[PDB]
């Protein structure tokens with residue numbers, strides 16, 4: 699993928715945003731911005747130019763499933779890749795996120811190799 703691809707990393711725990719940002723930096727992606735919940739995320743996304751979203755689920759103000767549904771329903775961003783990265787591991791959560799249009803899903807705790815693989819799986823799927 700294009701190393702200037704602009705990522706939005708969304709999680710309500712600063713520790714996880716930091717992990718994801720650093721993993722992206724290792725992979726060669728330095729154009730990375732953070733958001734703390736779905737509302738903060740949508741404000742950032744309205745500024746434009748984003749190419750990929752990595753998102754948590756359990757967050758205040760607007761949770762990640764609602765963020766994913768908002769993105770998918772909005773004509774300005776409906777094709778934005780969205781990777782869910784969440785501690786929710788139950789199959790009903792996976793099914794609900796998948797059905798809502800998640801580009802991929804990673805269960806916390808996750809390894810560096812898992813995130814790279816799942817990112818690459820999405821890049822390949824979308825011809826990026």
Ligand code: BEF
Pocket residue numbers: 754755756757783784785786806
């Ligand atoms: F709070 Be996230 F869903 F891990």
Ligand SMILES: [Cl-]
Pocket residue numbers: 802803
């Ligand atoms: Cl998978």
Ligand SMILES: [Mn+2]
Pocket residue numbers: 709710711754755756757
């Ligand atoms: Mn959370």
